[PDB]
Amino acid sequence: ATAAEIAALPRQKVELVDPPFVHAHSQVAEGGPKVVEFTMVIEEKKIVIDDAGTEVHAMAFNGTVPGPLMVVHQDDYLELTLINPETNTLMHNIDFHAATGALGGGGLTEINPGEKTILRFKATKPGVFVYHCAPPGMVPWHVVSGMNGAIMVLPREGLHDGKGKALTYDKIYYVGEQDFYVPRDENGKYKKYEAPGDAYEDTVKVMRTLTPTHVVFNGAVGALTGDKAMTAAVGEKVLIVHSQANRDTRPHLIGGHGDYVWATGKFNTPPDVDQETWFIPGGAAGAAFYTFQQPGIYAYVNHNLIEAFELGAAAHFKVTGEWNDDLMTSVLAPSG
Amino acid sequence: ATAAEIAALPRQKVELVDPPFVHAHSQVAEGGPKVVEFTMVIEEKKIVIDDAGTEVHAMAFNGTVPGPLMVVHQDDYLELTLINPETNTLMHNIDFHAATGALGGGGLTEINPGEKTILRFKATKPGVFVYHCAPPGMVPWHVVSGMNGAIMVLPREGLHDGKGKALTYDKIYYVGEQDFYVPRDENGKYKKYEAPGDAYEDTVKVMRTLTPTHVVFNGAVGALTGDKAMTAAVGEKVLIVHSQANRDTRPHLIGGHGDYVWATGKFNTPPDVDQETWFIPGGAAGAAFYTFQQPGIYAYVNHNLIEAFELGAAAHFKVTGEWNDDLMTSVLAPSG
Amino acid sequence: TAAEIAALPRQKVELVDPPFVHAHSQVAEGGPKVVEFTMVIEEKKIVIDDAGTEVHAMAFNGTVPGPLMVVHQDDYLELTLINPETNTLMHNIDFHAATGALGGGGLTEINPGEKTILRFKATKPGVFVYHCAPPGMVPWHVVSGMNGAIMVLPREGLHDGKGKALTYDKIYYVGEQDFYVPRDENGKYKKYEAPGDAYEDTVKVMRTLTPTHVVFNGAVGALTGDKAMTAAVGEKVLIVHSQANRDTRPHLIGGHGDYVWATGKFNTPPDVDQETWFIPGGAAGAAFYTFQQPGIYAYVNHNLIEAFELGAAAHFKVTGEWNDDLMTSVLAPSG
Ligand SMILES: O=N[O-]
Ligand SMILES: O=N[O-]
Ligand SMILES: O=N[O-]
Ligand SMILES: [Cu+2]
Ligand SMILES: [Cu+2]
Ligand SMILES: [Cu+2]
Ligand SMILES: [Cu+2]
Ligand SMILES: [Cu+2]
Ligand SMILES: [Cu+2]
Secondary structure, eight states: OOHHHHHTSOEEEOOOOOTTSOOOOOSBOSSSOOEEEEEEEEEEEEEEOSTTOOEEEEEEETTSSSOOOEEEETTOEEEEEEEEOTTOOSOBOOEETTSOSGGGGGGGOOBOTTEEEEEEEEOOSOEEEEEEOOOTTOHHHHHTTTOEEEEEEEOTBOEEOTTSOEEOOSEEEEEEEEEEOOOBOTTSOBOOOSSGGGGHHHHHHHHTTTOOSEEEETTBTTTTSGGGOEEEETTOEEEEEEEESSSOBOEEEETOOEEEEETTSBTTSOOEEEESSOOBOTTEEEEEEEEOOSOEEEEEEESSHHHHHTSSOEEEEEEESOOOTTTEEEEEEEEO | OOHHHHHTSOEEEOOOOOTTSOOOOOSBOOSSOOEEEEEEEEEEEEEEOSTTOOEEEEEEETTSSSOOOEEEETTOEEEEEEEEOTTOOSOBOOEETTSOSGGGGGGGOOBOTTEEEEEEEEOOSOEEEEEEOOOTTOHHHHHTTTOEEEEEEEOTBOEEOTTSOEEOOSEEEEEEEEEEOOOBOTTSOBOOOSSGGGGHHHHHHHHHTTOOSEEEETTBTTTTSGGGOEEEETTOEEEEEEEESSSOBOEEEETOOEEEEETTSBTTSOOEEEESSOOBOTTEEEEEEEEOOSOEEEEEEESSHHHHHTSSOEEEEEEESOOOTTTEEEEEEEEO | OHHHHHHSOEEEOOOOOTTSOOSOOSBOOSSOOEEEEEEEEEEEEEEOSTTOOEEEEEEETTSSSOOOEEEETTOEEEEEEEEOTTOOSOBOOEETTSOSGGGGGGGOOBOTTEEEEEEEEOOSOEEEEEEOOOTTOHHHHHTTTOEEEEEEEOTBOEEOTTSOEEOOSEEEEEEEEEEOOOBOTTSOBOOOSSGGGGHHHHHHHHHTTOOSEEEETTBTTTTSGGGOEEEETTOEEEEEEEESSSOBOEEEETOOEEEEETTSBTTSOOEEEESBOOBOTTEEEEEEEEOOSOEEEEEEESSHHHHHTSSOEEEEEEESOOOTTTEEEEEEEEO
16 A cells, blocks of 8 residues: 555544453454554553562563453554653564564564654564564563563454354453562572563573462462453353563363364464364464353363463353253262 | 253273374264363372482373373373372362363362372374363473373374375384473482472472473383384384473484474464474474484484583484485495 | 386585585476485584584584575485595485485494495485484584484475465575583583583583574574675575474564474475464475565574573574565654
8 A cells, every 4th residue: 555545544533441351343344444443551660470479570561461452354554652661661562473474563662761652564474473572682681571462453344264164253352471580589589670671680690590489370479360360251252362572381171172273373264173272382372262161160271281270371251141961961960 | 052952972092002102093084073081190209310319209191101102082082180199198170282271270179188080082183182180270290200201193194295185104203301400409410209298399400590400202211212112114104192291402313304294283373394303492392304214323302412412312213125226325335 | 116216317515515406496397316316424513603602513514504405395415425534423414305234324424534325315305304223322523513404395386275486586595503511610611622522511402402502504693794695675585494313493574474384294284374483303395485575684582591591593684675565664763
């Protein structure tokens, strides 16, 4: 498209919401290509990541870890206003894996505290894609401080299975998985700091072990449980978008499956089916579609079970509805 | 199906066999859906995992690590009687990744020492799938103590390639891969413990390093070598089912290939072909089909070669038959 | 038949050092051939980082990785492998592309002062790892750099999943190496007189499963700066990537993998529109991309600690016209 053609396209302003929720959207595109406008303010802030009060100096798009999910359709333009307030200490930028050119946008969006920028790119490829900050010379430090999220570029006709039949979800959730590398003192207690830069050298030492101290969803151990358990009902179709900007993960719905899984996250690559555990490499997003068939509590985990149940990578679903004894029944309950 | 309909189905009792062997079965289903009955007794038992005499307090379905392979067909019911003898010390349960509801069955099968339970589930999806114990709050400790195996749910019409041509194996082996996390003393020698509980705290410390001390097939370094090497012949079609309940692996047949590999383990997901090294994420099973073409000794490994050759993840095949100089020949033997 | 195999033409090919690739045609020229290559093994000290850190490299053809050999399906690859008398260790070669004798390793064990010639039929199309594998010291040779890859092209060249031809303008081979360099009690990397002197200390590092360095083309920054790979807007590039011991997850920063044979095997349909692909340890993969924007790209293992702390980052320098439709700065960084 020419500059004039793009200038004539309709604009739509979107209001972002905090993960694991996703902002309002339509699965099938409403009308032709649009310039979809988003704004995010970067917040450097302390987050508490476990029940021992361990702290991370988060670098948080829109104030959350992960940053929020942006949803557009293929061949829309995504136009992001990114703001780095004067209250922050570091330069930041943004790299969209969905975008083409200038290091995904990072080369055009380096903003010091007190600066803003507006980047537009054409969403040419359908899928879920990571975005993350990447300041030259400081790239993994910002990413493993939580400065990452994802977008979804839906096909204009919505999702389809590998034989071209529509797949339409009732609910969508976005699970951002984060590896953290928290320094410890000589007695094994996690260290606290009173500015992000003060933690840099100690954190790099831990990073270089390639062994996270914490692996968490939505920024903290237990975050997506209790008050933040995800919900569904028997018969409901749910899309679970999962990202990991730095490190591999292997998602698994305990008690369920991934009926269709775009494990690479790219919708023109046919989905795997009937999955027990899928695999998303560091630096990518993936998506799983499931229809719930049983009520009750489910756990949703990274299925390195040490990562899930020692290091923090476990969420819950609470599902309502009627139990199906054909699918599963206790013929003899635990007894002497 | 209604309760009355399920009650009218034929029952078939199966006698399990120890890995890497697989109990007798038919690739193509014989007759309509059946309730296929299995029994396993859980044994907490000391095992030796290397030639030095290193011990683990294993938690072993049917007394083996891995637990045995159960084989059914799609839309059969798997009915397991699980027994936790009074000689054991811990509560145990079972989660079938093939099943739907109640955390794969774990929520319905929590049995204390001196208890049993019977779980029935409908095997709705074709593939190989992990099963493992998962007591709330103690999940990875049981799994990495060996309390895991796999099942195979064959399509009722047997296996096919991605384009609908039948694939019929001559024999099948089940390789369960186990990551162990054995504590060491200040001399760097592995520790021994009187009861399983005494090892817990020390073992969790090793687990949290995400670095196993041992990575083994069939419960020990070298378990599938010597007189326990797997066997085949030139022309023979072999299915190798491989599981890893906790941690990634990358199987490879040294001197061979995976002609067809269901790397995700799910038979409705078309197999990859001509594979050198395939990838099975922690929490999953996969399956590879190969027709042997050359005689001699092969090694079957996890192709992180440190894991294979330092940590234990290497098996052997002995293969009979005639050497094929078209496929490979030594034109000049090592010489001055 | 025996006479048919003996009657096939034999063709010698001159190798080139990675990341470049020797002369070849994408579509096969003529019928099956026995394609002859020669490599000399070099044991030598290399410096792998900006601090003067040394590895005793074990290098096919003198490079880490060893060079890419290119044949077509149903050709034969006939390698003369030479272990000069100045070396100290026995070596061999395992081709993952080959069938039998542990990929060739069982037939090619050569002591210093020996050579051998191995022929195998390249029956399966794809990119495949090759590596040294002396029994009982396999990972040590591999993680000392003694690995590379081959490409077995389909006789009709590459195609997408719908049978449309994919023809590259250029090809690069990125071999990724995990190194495990011992350190003294003060954290300084150790140096050794002879390769064997480092064996025990190195195995201790290996068993941590944590590399000290993860590099392309044998050193931190080997494919950056003035050694960046190059392309132009509109150019179609195939990037072959291998890792003989350890997983990797390649990513072109600012680009994509338009078609990715992530398993490396061309009869397995390629994934499309990839952000980051995954190659397990012990395998090669290949990605096809048409460049659409000029400028500097990074190409990384997208464990960004591995990329930007441990060494696994390369660059492409791309010429041509910027496309504002694909991306534009609506408002440059400003107050
Ligand atoms: O599926 N239980 O980890
Ligand atoms: O294929 N030898 O690891
Ligand atoms: O795609 N930036 O690592
Ligand atoms: Cu930042
Ligand atoms: Cu990135
Ligand atoms: Cu148990
Ligand atoms: Cu599980
Ligand atoms: Cu060697
Ligand atoms: Cu190998």
